[PDB]
Amino acid sequence: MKRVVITGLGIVSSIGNNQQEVLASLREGRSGITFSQELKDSGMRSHVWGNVKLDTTGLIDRKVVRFMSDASIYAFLSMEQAIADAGLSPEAYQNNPRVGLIAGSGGGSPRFQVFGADAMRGPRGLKAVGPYVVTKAMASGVSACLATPFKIHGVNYSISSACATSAHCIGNAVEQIQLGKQDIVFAGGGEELCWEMACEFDAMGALSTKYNDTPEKASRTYDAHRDGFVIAGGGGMVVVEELEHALARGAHIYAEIVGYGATSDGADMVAPSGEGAVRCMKMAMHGVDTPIDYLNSHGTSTPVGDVKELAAIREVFGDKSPAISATAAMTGHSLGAAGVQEAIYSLLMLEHGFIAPSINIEELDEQAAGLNIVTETTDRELTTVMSNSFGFGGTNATLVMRKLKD
Amino acid sequence: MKRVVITGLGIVSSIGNNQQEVLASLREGRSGITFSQELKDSGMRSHVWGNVKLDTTGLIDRKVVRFMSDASIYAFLSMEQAIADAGLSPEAYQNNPRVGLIAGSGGGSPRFQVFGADAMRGPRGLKAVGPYVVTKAMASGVSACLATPFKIHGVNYSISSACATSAHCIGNAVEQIQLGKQDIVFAGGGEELCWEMACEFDAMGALSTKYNDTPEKASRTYDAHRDGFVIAGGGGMVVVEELEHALARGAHIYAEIVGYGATSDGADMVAPSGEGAVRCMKMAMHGVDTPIDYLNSHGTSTPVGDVKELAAIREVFGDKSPAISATAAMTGHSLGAAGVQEAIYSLLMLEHGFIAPSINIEELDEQAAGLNIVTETTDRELTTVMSNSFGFGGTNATLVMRKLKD
Ligand SMILES: [N+]
Ligand SMILES: [N+]
Ligand SMILES: [N+]
Ligand SMILES: [N+]
């Protein structure tokens, strides 16, 4: 079938408002986690988050941003970055049936959903709600709010799969190109950061709560003292393009997507079975004649999750396990945006030949023994990288990206 | 070039809790719209809805339903029906990497998102929120809550595209089969019915508000006095299966999915451009050399939307316009669940050889002149049918289904 490559990327995360800032943070093992007064004031036990340090005010046209929630804003900014980074101009991607958009969020916008209900319950009712809540709270807000202003004419929808959301978006974009339906598909997602949504995760005890005094140490994937993930927000977008089309326009190709796995655990609702992850990684590795040099694990810094994935990794690679690092230890877990952001971190590592450190590992978990977990920025000529994304509902996504040629 | 067919269906809608009840309602032109005290008490102007007339209490295992919102409950029930209808035993679809599930909702669960925020702000805080809000509120709730209990091992995620949601789910399922990645994919969706979400639509003036005294006459697609859609809830699921696989096990085949269109308007956020719909239908008709005998329009009973779609239909078919009826006049518009429910209504019309009436047209809109809008149940041997689904954000989906031979 058609070969697919990534020709542009854009990102707004807790560790950088663009790929340059993100690159700098990854190289330095810099944490994007900070103390959140908002989370504390809400009554939560987790008082830390990976927030986007960016004043979005005036960055998007008033008539466009009025329909957007933060997830959409983050994705929109990421898309603007990816478009420029891909070297694409309106005449090329706008009003083009061959150019699509597949991007979503894990929870749409709890903030505006609550805003709507709060306003409605007030004395002004519908007048207080306003006519822009649907597009903001809508589960497809991210795709709707981007496809419209960017004049996308091809595929247009969101894929939702919790923590695997943007990973499946990328995989689905790849499929659209392999099916010969699209030449370019902007894929990714965004996730707002708010107590409205964060309290739901805290309520199930999934968030870190023992390190509120030392925010940068809260997310500690593989550390024996980890106690939950640190919620994060942000966006990411990559330009997925058919190989010949990219070469024809002399695009800059970060890597080719040579593998995409999407499986289901069909077991536990909020806990990984590991079995699903094994099949997912194997599916993404099928046909890949090159070994995985680096693996950006899901590793959100959870007691059971972290180890379950490592067990799956050991089962897939055996004694030939690749270098592993969980960027979440630095960035936190951006839920729906995690897939594309982590795919981007992996692409930056592949592009700049280095492995980002898995920080805050003061005491490696006993179940992370015979594995190569990189805890220090290491320069290395990577060729093939893998990124795993596992969300609630036992949904798994794995992407394998490899350098093209020369 | 794998061929894809529908071998089972399940539905929970305002006009029936199974395909038999729905069949009867369709043939009788029975309205599923009722007065809603809940909507009225919330302060809304629209006091009518297409509610699911069923008490789901006890229909789902306690340990399973605890993670579900109404959208998931409706989809789950629909899936049970679809599995039984397809004659699939547990050992035939469970723990099978070749069996997937793609189902979503338009807004996840505004009710539980609001519940979480409300509980969190109360005297109990996190204790009142509970550990089940995430799976209920997340956008992928429908796929997550079904893939897990049904032991799905293949693809598992939700497609979100507002009112086109479940249509894109079906189309994506078709693609998975065409890609040879799955043999069977359960596709569909669900949508809860609540003021929390409904008030958002009312706040933008999208809902009918002039017929609260006569609920069954509120939804009146193509009527000159239509004033907005009537919100509805419910679920639907279809068993999308590779042709050879279905034939091998002697499954009952409703129809082959011979066309699937998915496009984007790249124009207005809450209004259809018509141009996108034209491309969507044309895309779904590629290679389909049989005429469309019946077209189930999106037709939600909105002033602009109703005629915008009719114009697109005229552009696509010209002087060969098919018989048209908007089932939404009877059922109301179930947002994310509309795609699959309407595909199911179309499949029932195809299976039973009749065209459901487009009711409540007391005065046909002047822009509908020269069209074959069916206003009375008509027995007819249909062979190829088309169903359109358009959502906010300019997202379009079209499905074309055709009866297989003998
Ligand atoms: N992650
Ligand atoms: N990852
Ligand atoms: N509809
Ligand atoms: N439809």
Residue B215 is part of a domain; what is its CATH number?
A: 3.40.47.10
- CA–CA–CA angle A64, A65, A66 (5° rounding): 90
A148 to B265: CB separation less than 8 angstroms, yes or no: yes
Cα of A295 vs centre of ligand 2, distance in Å, is: 8
Q: Are residues B200 and B268 in the same domain?
A: no
Q: Are B156 and B71 in contact (CB under 8 A)?
A: no
Has residue B99 been placed in a domain? yes
Residues B239 and B6: their CA atoms lie apart, in Å, by 5
A394 to B147: CB separation less than 8 angstroms, yes or no: yes
Residues B400 and B396: their CA atoms lie apart, in Å, by 14
| Closest Cβ opposite residue B100 in set A133, A205, A264 | A264
Q: Are A99 and A239 in contact (CB under 8 A)?
A: no
Has residue B1 been placed in a domain? no
DSSP B119-156: HHTSTTTHHHH-TTHHHHHSTTHHHHHHHTTTT--S-E
Q: Are residues B78 and B192 in the same domain?
A: yes
Q: Are residues A58 and A156 in the same domain?
A: yes
Residues whose CB falls within 8 Å of the CB of residue A26, separated by 6 or more in sequence, listed in order? A15, A327, A330, A345, A348, A349, A354, A356, A377
Q: Are residues B219 and B148 in the same domain?
A: yes
List all residues of chain A from 355 to 384 with a beta carbon under 8 Å from chain B: none
Is residue A281 within 6 Å of ligand 1 at its C-beta? no
- B301 phi/psi in degrees, rounded to 5: 85, 35
- Can you give the residue range of the structural domain that contains B302? 260-404
- Ligand 2 environment, Cβ below 6 A: A 296-298, 342, 387-389
Which of A212, A236, A259 delimits the end of a domain?
A: A259
List all residues of chain A from 59 to 78 with a beta carbon under 8 Å from chain B: 67
Q: Which residues of B touch A165 (CB under 8 A)?
A: 139-140, 157
Structure tokens at A71: 């997830």
Q: This structure's resolution (angstroms)?
A: 1.7
Structure tokens at B229: 């859609």
Q: Are residues A267 and A200 in the same domain?
A: no
Beta strands A4-12 and A99-104, pairing class: unpaired
A130 to B161: CB separation less than 8 angstroms, yes or no: no
Which of A217, A236, A259 delimits the end of a domain?
A: A259
User: Mutate which of A46, A159, A169, A185 to test chain B, going by most B C-beta atoms within 10 A?
Assistant: A159
Which is it for the CA torsion B173, B175, B178, B179, positive or negative?
A: negative
Q: Are residues B192 and B117 in the same domain?
A: yes
| Closest Cβ opposite residue A264 in set B155, B199, B266 | B155
Neighbour tally for A388: CB within 10 Å:
28
DSSP A55-118: --TTSS-HHHHTT--HHHHHHHHHHHHHHHHHT--HHHHTT-TTEEEEEE-SSS-HHHHHHHHH
Residues B195 and B45: their CA atoms lie apart, in Å, by 11
Structure tokens at B273: 């451009």
Which is it for the CA torsion A347, A350, A354, A355, positive or negative?
A: positive
Which of B259, B288, B313 delimits the end of a domain?
A: B259
Ligand with an atom nearest the CA of residue A191: 1
Q: Are residues B134 and B282 in the same domain?
A: no
B148 to A267: CB separation less than 8 angstroms, yes or no: yes
| Number of folded domains that form chain A | 2
B126 to A391: CB separation less than 8 angstroms, yes or no: no
Q: Are residues B68 and B183 in the same domain?
A: yes
Amino acid symbol at A333 = H
Q: Are residues A277 and A169 in the same domain?
A: no
Helices (H) and strands (E) in chain B, counts: 16, 15
Place of tokens 């898995």: A358
Has residue B15 been placed in a domain? yes
Q: Which residues of A touch B138 (CB under 8 A)?
A: 106-107, 160, 162, 392
